[PDB]
Amino acid sequence: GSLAFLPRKRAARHRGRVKSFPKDDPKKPVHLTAAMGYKAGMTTIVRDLDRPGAKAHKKEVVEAVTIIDCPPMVVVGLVGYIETPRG
Amino acid sequence: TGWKDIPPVPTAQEFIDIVLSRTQRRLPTQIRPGFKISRIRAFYTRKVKFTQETCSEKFGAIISSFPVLSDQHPFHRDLMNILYDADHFKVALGQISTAKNLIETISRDYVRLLKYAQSLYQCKQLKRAALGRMATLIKRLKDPLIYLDQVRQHLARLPDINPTTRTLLVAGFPNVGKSSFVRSVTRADTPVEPYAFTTKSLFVGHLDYKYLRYQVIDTPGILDHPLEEMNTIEMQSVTALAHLRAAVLYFMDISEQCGFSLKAQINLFKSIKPLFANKMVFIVLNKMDIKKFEELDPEMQQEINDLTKSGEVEILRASCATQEGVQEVKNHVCERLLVERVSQKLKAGTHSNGNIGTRLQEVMARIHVATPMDGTTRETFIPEAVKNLKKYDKNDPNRRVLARDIEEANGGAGVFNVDLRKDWILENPEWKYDKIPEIFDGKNVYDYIDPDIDAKLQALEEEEERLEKEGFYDED
Amino acid sequence: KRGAPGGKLKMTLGLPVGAIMNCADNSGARNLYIIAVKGAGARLNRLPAGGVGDMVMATVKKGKPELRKKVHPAVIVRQAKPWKRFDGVFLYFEDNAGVIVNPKGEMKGSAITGPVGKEAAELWPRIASNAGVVM
Amino acid sequence: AKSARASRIKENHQRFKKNIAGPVEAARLERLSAKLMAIAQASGVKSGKSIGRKDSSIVFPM
Amino acid sequence: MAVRAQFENSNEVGVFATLTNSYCLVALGASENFYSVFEAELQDVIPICRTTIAGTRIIGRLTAGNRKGLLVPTTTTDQELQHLRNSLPDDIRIQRIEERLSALGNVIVCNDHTALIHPDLERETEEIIADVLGVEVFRQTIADHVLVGSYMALSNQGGLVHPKTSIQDQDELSSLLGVPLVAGSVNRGSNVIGGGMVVNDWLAVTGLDTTAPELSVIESVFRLGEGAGPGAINTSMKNTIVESFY
Amino acid sequence: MRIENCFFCGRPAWPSKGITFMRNDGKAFRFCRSKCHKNFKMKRNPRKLKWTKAYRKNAGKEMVVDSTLQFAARRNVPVRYNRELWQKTLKAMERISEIRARRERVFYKKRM
Amino acid sequence: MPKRAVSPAPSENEVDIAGSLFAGGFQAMGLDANLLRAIARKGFSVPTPIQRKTIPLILERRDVVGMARTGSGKTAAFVIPMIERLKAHSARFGARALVLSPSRELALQTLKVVKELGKGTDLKTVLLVGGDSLEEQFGLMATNPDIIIATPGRFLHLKVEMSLDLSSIKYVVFDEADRLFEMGFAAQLTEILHALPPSRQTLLFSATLPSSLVEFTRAGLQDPVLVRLDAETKVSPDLESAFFSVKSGEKEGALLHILYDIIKMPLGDPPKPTEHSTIIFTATKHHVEYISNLLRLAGFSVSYVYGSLDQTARKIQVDNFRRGRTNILVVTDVAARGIDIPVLANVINYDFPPQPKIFVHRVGRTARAGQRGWAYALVRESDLPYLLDLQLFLGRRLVLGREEKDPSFARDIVVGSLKRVELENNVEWVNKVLHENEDIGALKRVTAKAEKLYMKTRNPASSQSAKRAREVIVSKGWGQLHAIFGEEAANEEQVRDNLLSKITGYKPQETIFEINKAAEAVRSFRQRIGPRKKAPKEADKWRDDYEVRKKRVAEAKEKR
Amino acid sequence: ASTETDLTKKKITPMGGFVRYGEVNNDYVMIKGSVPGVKKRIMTLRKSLFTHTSRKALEKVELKWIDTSSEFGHGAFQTAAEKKQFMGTLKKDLQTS
RNA sequence: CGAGAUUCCCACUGUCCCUAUCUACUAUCUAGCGAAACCACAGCCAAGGGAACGGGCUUGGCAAAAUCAGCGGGGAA
RNA sequence: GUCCCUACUGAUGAACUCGUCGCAAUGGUAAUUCAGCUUAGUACGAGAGGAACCGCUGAUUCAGAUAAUUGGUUUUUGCGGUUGUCCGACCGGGCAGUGCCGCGAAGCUACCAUCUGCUGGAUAAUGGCUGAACGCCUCUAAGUCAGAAUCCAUGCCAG
Numbered sequence A: 001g002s003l004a005f006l007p008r009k010r011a012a013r014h015r016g017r018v019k020s021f022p023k024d025d026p027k028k029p030v031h032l033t034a035a036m037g038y039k040a041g042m043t044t045i046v047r048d049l050d051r052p053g054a055k056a057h058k059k060e061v062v063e064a065v066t067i068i069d070c071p072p073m074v075v076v077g078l079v080g081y082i083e084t085p086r087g
Numbered sequence B: 001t002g003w004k005d006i007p008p009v010p011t012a013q014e015f016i017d018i019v020l021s022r023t024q025r026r027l028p029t030q031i032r033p034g035f036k037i038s039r040i041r042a043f044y045t046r047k048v049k050f051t052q053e054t055c056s057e058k059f060g061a062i063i064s065s066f067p068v069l070s071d072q073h074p075f076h077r078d079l080m081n082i083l084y085d086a087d088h089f090k091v092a093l094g095q096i097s098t099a100k101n102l103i104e105t106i107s108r109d110y111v112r113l114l115k116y117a118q119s120l121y122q123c124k125q126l127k128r129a130a131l132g133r134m135a136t137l138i139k140r141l142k143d144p145l146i147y148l149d150q151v152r153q154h155l156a157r158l159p160d161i162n163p164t165t166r167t168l169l170v171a172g173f174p175n176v177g178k179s180s181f182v183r184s185v186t187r188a189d190t191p192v193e194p195y196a197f198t199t200k201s202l203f204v205g206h207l208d209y210k211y212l213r214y215q216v217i218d219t220p221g222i223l224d225h226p227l228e229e230m231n232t233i234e235m236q237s238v239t240a241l242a243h244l245r246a247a248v249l250y251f252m253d254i255s256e257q258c259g260f261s262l263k264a265q266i267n268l269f270k271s272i273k274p275l276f277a278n279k280m281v282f283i284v285l286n287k288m289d290i291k292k293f294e295e296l297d298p299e300m301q302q303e304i305n306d307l308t309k310s311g312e313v314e315i316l317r318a319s320c321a322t323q324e325g326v327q328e329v330k331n332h333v334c335e336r337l338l339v340e341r342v343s344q345k346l347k348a349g350t351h352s353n354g355n356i357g358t359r360l361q362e363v364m365a366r367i368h369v370a371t372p373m374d375g376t377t378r379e380t381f382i383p384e385a386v387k388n389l390k391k392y393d394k395n396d397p398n399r400r401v402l403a404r405d406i407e408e409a410n411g412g413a414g415v416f417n418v419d420l421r422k423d424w425i426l427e428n429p430e431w432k433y434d435k436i437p438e439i440f441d442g443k444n445v446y447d448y449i450d451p452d453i454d455a456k457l458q459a460l461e462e463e464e465e466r467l468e469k470e471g472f473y474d475e476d
Numbered sequence C: 001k002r003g004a005p006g007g008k009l010k011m012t013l014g015l016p017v018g019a020i021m022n023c024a025d026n027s028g029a030r031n032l033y034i035i036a037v038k039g040a041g042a043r044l045n046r047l048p049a050g051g052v053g054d055m056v057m058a059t060v061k062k063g064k065p066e067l068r069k070k071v072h073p074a075v076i077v078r079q080a081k082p083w084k085r086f087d088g089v090f091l092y093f094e095d096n097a098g099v100i101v102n103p104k105g106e107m108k109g110s111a112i113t114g115p116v117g118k119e120a121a122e123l124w125p126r127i128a129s130n131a132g133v134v135m
Numbered sequence D: 001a002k003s004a005r006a007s008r009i010k011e012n013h014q015r016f017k018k019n020i021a022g023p024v025e026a027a028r029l030e031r032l033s034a035k036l037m038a039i040a041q042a043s044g045v046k047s048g049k050s051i052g053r054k055d056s057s058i059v060f061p062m
Numbered sequence E: 001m002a003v004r005a006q007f008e009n010s011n012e013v014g015v016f017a018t019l020t021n022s023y024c025l026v027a028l029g030a031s032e033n034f035y036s037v038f039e040a041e042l043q044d045v046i047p048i049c050r051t052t053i054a055g056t057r058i059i060g061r062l063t064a065g066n067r068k069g070l071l072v073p074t075t076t077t078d079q080e081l082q083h084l085r086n087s088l089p090d091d092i093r094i095q096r097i098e099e100r101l102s103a104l105g106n107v108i109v110c111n112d113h114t115a116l117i118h119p120d121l122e123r124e125t126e127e128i129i130a131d132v133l134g135v136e137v138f139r140q141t142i143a144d145h146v147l148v149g150s151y152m153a154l155s156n157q158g159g160l161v162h163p164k165t166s167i168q169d170q171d172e173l174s175s176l177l178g179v180p181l182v183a184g185s186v187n188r189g190s191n192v193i194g195g196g197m198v199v200n201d202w203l204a205v206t207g208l209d210t211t212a213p214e215l216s217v218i219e220s221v222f223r224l225g226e227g228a229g230p231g232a233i234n235t236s237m238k239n240t241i242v243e244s245f246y
Numbered sequence F: 001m002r003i004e005n006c007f008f009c010g011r012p013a014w015p016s017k018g019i020t021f022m023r024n025d026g027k028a029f030r031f032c033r034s035k036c037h038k039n040f041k042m043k044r045n046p047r048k049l050k051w052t053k054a055y056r057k058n059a060g061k062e063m064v065v066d067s068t069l070q071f072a073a074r075r076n077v078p079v080r081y082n083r084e085l086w087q088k089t090l091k092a093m094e095r096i097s098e099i100r101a102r103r104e105r106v107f108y109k110k111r112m
Numbered sequence G: 001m002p003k004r005a006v007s008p009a010p011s012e013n014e015v016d017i018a019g020s021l022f023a024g025g026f027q028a029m030g031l032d033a034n035l036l037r038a039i040a041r042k043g044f045s046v047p048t049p050i051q052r053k054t055i056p057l058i059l060e061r062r063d064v065v066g067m068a069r070t071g072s073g074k075t076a077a078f079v080i081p082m083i084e085r086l087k088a089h090s091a092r093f094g095a096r097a098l099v100l101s102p103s104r105e106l107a108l109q110t111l112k113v114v115k116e117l118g119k120g121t122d123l124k125t126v127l128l129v130g131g132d133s134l135e136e137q138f139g140l141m142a143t144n145p146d147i148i149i150a151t152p153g154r155f156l157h158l159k160v161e162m163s164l165d166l167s168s169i170k171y172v173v174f175d176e177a178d179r180l181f182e183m184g185f186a187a188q189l190t191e192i193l194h195a196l197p198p199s200r201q202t203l204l205f206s207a208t209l210p211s212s213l214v215e216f217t218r219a220g221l222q223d224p225v226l227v228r229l230d231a232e233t234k235v236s237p238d239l240e241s242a243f244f245s246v247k248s249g250e251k252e253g254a255l256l257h258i259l260y261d262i263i264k265m266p267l268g269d270p271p272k273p274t275e276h277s278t279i280i281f282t283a284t285k286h287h288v289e290y291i292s293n294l295l296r297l298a299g300f301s302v303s304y305v306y307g308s309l310d311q312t313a314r315k316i317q318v319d320n321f322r323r324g325r326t327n328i329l330v331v332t333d334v335a336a337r338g339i340d341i342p343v344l345a346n347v348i349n350y351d352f353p354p355q356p357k358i359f360v361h362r363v364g365r366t367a368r369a370g371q372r373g374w375a376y377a378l379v380r381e382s383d384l385p386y387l388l389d390l391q392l393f394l395g396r397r398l399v400l401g402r403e404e405k406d407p408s409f410a411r412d413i414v415v416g417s418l419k420r421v422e423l424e425n426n427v428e429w430v431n432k433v434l435h436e437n438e439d440i441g442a443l444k445r446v447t448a449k450a451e452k453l454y455m456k457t458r459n460p461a462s463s464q465s466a467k468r469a470r471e472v473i474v475s476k477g478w479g480q481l482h483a484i485f486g487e488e489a490a491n492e493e494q495v496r497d498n499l500l501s502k503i504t505g506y507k508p509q510e511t512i513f514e515i516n517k518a519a520e521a522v523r524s525f526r527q528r529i530g531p532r533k534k535a536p537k538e539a540d541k542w543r544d545d546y547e548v549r550k551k552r553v554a555e556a557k558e559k560r
Numbered sequence H: 001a002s003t004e005t006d007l008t009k010k011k012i013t014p015m016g017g018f019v020r021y022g023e024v025n026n027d028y029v030m031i032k033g034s035v036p037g038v039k040k041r042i043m044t045l046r047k048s049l050f051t052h053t054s055r056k057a058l059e060k061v062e063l064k065w066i067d068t069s070s071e072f073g074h075g076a077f078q079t080a081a082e083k084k085q086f087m088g089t090l091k092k093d094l095q096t097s
Numbered sequence I: 001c002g003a004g005a006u007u008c009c010c011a012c013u014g015u016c017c018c019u020a021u022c023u024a025c026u027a028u029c030u031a032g033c034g035a036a037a038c039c040a041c042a043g044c045c046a047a048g049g050g051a052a053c054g055g056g057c058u059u060g061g062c063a064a065a066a067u068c069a070g071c072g073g074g075g076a077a
Numbered sequence J: 001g002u003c004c005c006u007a008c009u010g011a012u013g014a015a016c017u018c019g020u021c022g023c024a025a026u027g028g029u030a031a032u033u034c035a036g037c038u039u040a041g042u043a044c045g046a047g048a049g050g051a052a053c054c055g056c057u058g059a060u061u062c063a064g065a066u067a068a069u070u071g072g073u074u075u076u077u078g079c080g081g082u083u084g085u086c087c088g089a090c091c092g093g094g095c096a097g098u099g100c101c102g103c104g105a106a107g108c109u110a111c112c113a114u115c116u117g118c119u120g121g122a123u124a125a126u127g128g129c130u131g132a133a134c135g136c137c138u139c140u141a142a143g144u145c146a147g148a149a150u151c152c153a154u155g156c157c158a159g
């Protein structure tokens, strides 16, 4: 197997840590970076492909798609981080 | 097809350097005195065998790749002989074989010596001695490699003609205008510089004549020498004229501007006449614009007509400077060549027996034209629009839009997305760019499309009203 | 160019090396013996498998005496192994069939018996030309 | 085949980023931030404006 | 006027296209070279429909029709039928037919006057062909080949026929059609004329590998260009044919 | 997209559902489930099998006649696009749906 | 993958007449009355020379090695004395006669001959070939036959399986031993030889005598007498010979020229051999296929028979040739010795044979029973030394070009060049076909690779043959026209080629580079070369034929 | 689950509800392809760290329909309405009514 | 039911694998009972350690209790 | 003429009051190749033939995932069928170390199915800029630019 994913470790937390966020520049307008939901399941869709240069262009394409139930999330806190020579 | 796919050959020092580089780099290189004597001898004999193998494969590639002189068409063999002395080429390509064979002999010799070697220093000096023998052999082979490299380079940069195909040779004295004629008739670049031997090699162009390919060859030229003594350039010229089964055109000029007397051209042509007796030959009076065919002296006219007397010769006029008659002369000569080729093709298959060849049966099947016995012609639908629209021309500025130009403006092959909605034709225009329902309540809207469905629904509603009057839903 | 089709989507290849498939064209062969699949990758212990629209080396084990025990390229036309199609449709054929083809694309035969896969017909134009049934 | 980390491919990817996906993601994030704002608006010491103290392995013990 | 064109790199323009008098159908491709060549030859005199049949690239061999009507197989979908109907003018009828022989272009070759069908074609399919296309139908094979559409091509001016057809077979075929016929090769000698080329009343498209003699004979037989060639031109330059095709 | 009708099982087979198997003489069968696929492979008669729609049909258990059933047919001649036509088609679709529901109910009522 | 996967299937046909170092009716030979009646019923009225020479020796109980072509009656030759020695079935357990044959078809042919010639006798004959049931062979051995006809591998397998005792065998026949050795049966042949008792009479019938076969016969036969088919090596005086020096690039066109003009062969299907009977002998099976396809494209009636061809295919081809449906027969060597070839009128060898004796066999294949025959050879510069070995072997004077006005084409080996005009036209048409149809080009490439391998694997010539090959190449006769083309031709080409001879004999003064270090090297090189002075499935109720299938199942169960 | 192509008023949840999950009544995200995790598990969606380099992104999607047959079996009835209409009336439903 | 018409297979092997069948061998936990071999003292790794002698020693890398389950490194002719 | 110690990994783990949300030193690190469209029958070329950049679309291998759909597996022993036996017979049973035959959910799966695989800097060969040694000259001496699938980090995994 791949050496970047071994030894096989259990996930310390059932939730899942984000680790890395997109890099910040002041110029864009304000926006959140993340959201959460719950994997409900998957269904099948058929789509009019709009990929120029593809063999199946402008044709019915059948794909499998995951459904994530996403109730509205509630803001309950703010946190302020400071940049330090130790991170 | 040619001879350009001939691998380059190195010099002596080069070949030594690369061969020793392979035997150094491609095999294990470390051995120790503490190792077993059997493994030591195996190591050193593997070195010797690899050196043998690389030398043998390289020399084998070289020999088997150079051309085999006396299996080619006589044009080719004599052309490569005049360019490159055949006996000397052959003694070279000889030395190289004998040298390779001696390499394999030394290989077995030192293989037995290493097999019976008894010490590491023994194997040391044995391998050193063997590799020294091959090094000295190539060192003596230094000069053949240079000669063969030069012949390889030219044989690569050699024009490739087809002796069998329809060919037209242009010959004569130098400066007559052969190169000018060939540039006029075909798209081949030939130096037209005005000095005696401008072209030192045969030049080749191609033309089309009612959808048929012809190859035109320009030869350098021939002087008054009686073919016993010649320059090599004149020798390749005469070899082409003698071994290229083709139409022959001899370009001569009434003006002695070429530097040779009309009598000199007459003597040269009668000398080369037996070489052209079998063929069809065409003397072309060039530079008629500066010196026409009338004004020269009557006995000169008489001698050129006496030359004309024979039945396989023809006379034509041309002026390559203004291109007065190049089209006409090429058309006429190639037409007669085509007629002769047709005659030969008919004879091949019309040979005496009474049974025609399968290819000839096929050619009659192809040439046969079918026509209805009734002789009636069906009426045709050609519209006046395509009758009077304009022809499609790429350089024309005031151009149509073109889907290609729309594509290039809006991206490329994988960028532009074509829209069929603009091509849709509909009664109400804003109908376009509208979604079309397909499935509804699990039944196909398309499958249930039908005109007069309003009247059919009215009929169904009348039927349901009759049923309701019948009480077709009451509970008892 | 090496004899590998260009512009082919993924499918469930169902014809391994060494497979006895039946013949499709009127060349005279009764069956073709898949012995080598052109374009297959280099993986150890993995038997090269071919699908519809792939030229595969074939050998006539049973056929007319003129054409018997002859090796020439051939392209897969029908496969009984189920494969899916981009419209989400899983389909398979009754048999395993291929038509003898030269490496440029000229088929030795003249008529193709039975139906022809859309993949083979699209990847090779003359298969569509000389194929009387393509579905 | 050129590596995924090849300099030429990196330069082409940067050009694509700056010329194609740029404006699309810009307009996307513009409408997103607009809807974010829609939802969102949908004594110094005694007041807390001056920052004070709340409520050592860097310096040696003294 | 016959132009050499490539769909992507294949010379089987007949395979990738169907061309009739009142319309021409072009397959959907990653590029518009092929559509643009057809519009260049036909600057909007007749509709050029970008059509796909049953999700297939091979429209030339999966549809057959003439001016009066178009025939497409069961395998095509409702979207594609609506594509053909809406793109095609009202003067033109379009029909989907149910045949075991799906390759309708292969089993059917037709012009504004006549039509030829596969020997094994169904009777109901024959009658629907007749009443939809408004043409009369005969049953015939081309050089003992059953795929008339692929192995041979029709035009109201003239026709090009399988090269190996016997003289008597060619004579009877030409008589029953009522149009001039010539047996010849296309695409540098490809045996498949119908797949090699597609031709309408007043122009033709071939592959680039078609040689100049066969280009000229196509011009003559199909009365293209200035119409100077009725076939007497082919007889005049027979010598070129004899040398080239020996 | 077009809702297929299952050959053996009968039911309205959907895209990405069922398998397609065509036999070399040229005929293609769409199977809604592996159940009907295998039942057709095992040479069973759909007439003999009781759960099959066409048996339920031939037995008279499911109603056979009437203008509504003549409405359901595969159309072979296409028509140019028109919002008015398609929307009147949709309201007709609802109207026909209630027709079929009521008439199936009453047919079963006289069956019992 | 399967292009020369193992080796060229026709390898070579090696013969060693040095094996000669080993040493008129049936009523006159006095066979039994029943055997005479069986022979008369079979139709053998006059014995052919092979059995006329061998049967008395076999009746005298001497070991025999018989050099005889296929079809001369070798099977009858070794079965008639065998039956005459047996005369009855033996009540004692143990086989008495054993015959070993290469293939099952030849074994079946031998079995049919044995049955037909022993109609009436109580001799039990068995066939043991691959593919048959081992249990059936065990049962046959239990029934205890007196005569066995078998292949070496199957016979060895049965012997190992049953621990069979061969001490009772007194009569041993090796049919087609050269074919046995070519197929590689030598190991089990030697094993069977060791297993057989020393007190046996050994007959070995072969068309060729390879060195390995000679060694095997010397090691395993007790004073063998070598019988040969009369004057098989004596070239018939009625054989006319012409040899053509041809280049590789013009060589197919030269063959077409010989077929078109020299023989004047009609084109198309012909309307017991024919009047022309053109056979061509080549080196490799790839050459056979290439030449066959090219000639059918040209319009000839060609049948091709090569070494590793399918049995039914080769029978059909040989039947077509012998019944005259085809006029040309293309074969290398192996299929030639294998198949029955009737009297021929034209023989052409495409690839010159390495061995003069192979050439002798190939030219004795024609001109038989006093009939005149024609033989044309295609000889290259590399094939010239083998031609010189041939002229030494035949003892015939060499006529190069036109050194003699009227050379005797039967007694003098006449070599010349072919006519340039028709040569070039056939070369042009060959080139056109090669450029046009790709199949022929692929065949050209594979036959070129096969020819290269054959050049490496061909037996070399002699040093002196190479020598006077060099002097022949130096001589003028190599490039001159053949004597068959006419004295008027001789006149025109003699008027012309003399200045052409001067052109070809040009010694250039300096190379074009002389016209740098490379130039200096060329000049020094020049100075150096300066010249020296099954039951049905269970019935299903839903199935339509439920009751019928149930009845079938019940019937099968009753049958058990 | 209703799409412009088919005016079939239904939710994203197929017949009988999601197997081992239930029926969703909230905002939901429908994403292409197989995605790590199992049912009932928390899924963390986040933005890409880098601006995209393919037309797969900024390719606009147009849908046709969503499979709403019961995934608990090999069903082919998208809506209860069409199911109760096609199957007709049953004896248990008739006795209840 | 139609002589109903048409299509596919059957071989051997002193060859390999799988599945099917037969015989034989196989079983865990907690309670209770309960040995033996062996044991100068203990075992991280790298280079050095004249005598192919390292576990001592020198210089370093470093070095955090205790269990269960896998795993690999050492112990002359 | 012969069973011992311990490193490592995973899972646990005592005390630091319990719990939530985080940081990241450190260690590992992953993508590979081929193909098709356009460029283009263009540049080039006597002919034959015949590119590359940009852009687009696929495929091989490897890696991490997933069961919407398709095959496969049935201690779900679910539904239907069925073989023989005995209990005198019904009955219901033992029955064939779970009887066999069809279809079958869920689950598990499949190179037998689907998805995904990412960006900055510094460099080596080399090509340069400015310019001394050496009044010419020079990529080098000072200063400096570009440049390989290279290296280092982000993206990823552990914490």
Ligand SMILES: Nc1nc2c(ncn2[C@@H]2O[C@H](COP(=O)(O)OP(=O)(O)OP(=O)(O)O)[C@@H](O)[C@H]2O)c(=O)[nH]1
Pocket (backbone or CB within 6 Å): B173, B174, B175, B176, B177, B178, B179, B180, B181, B191, B192, B193, B194, B195, B196, B197, B198, B199, B286, B287, B288, B290, B318, B319, B320, B321, B322
């Ligand atoms: N006025 C005139 N001059 C001509 C004509 N043709 C050739 N020339 C002269 O020929 C000169 C060049 O020589 P070429 O045209 O090459 O004649 P050539 O026979 O090929 O001999 P080379 O020069 O050695 O190649 C030009 O300078 C012209 O002056 C012609 O038709 N008219």
Ligand SMILES: [Zn+2]
Pocket (backbone or CB within 6 Å): F008, F009, F031, F032, F033, F034, F035, F036, F037
């Ligand atoms: Zn079903």
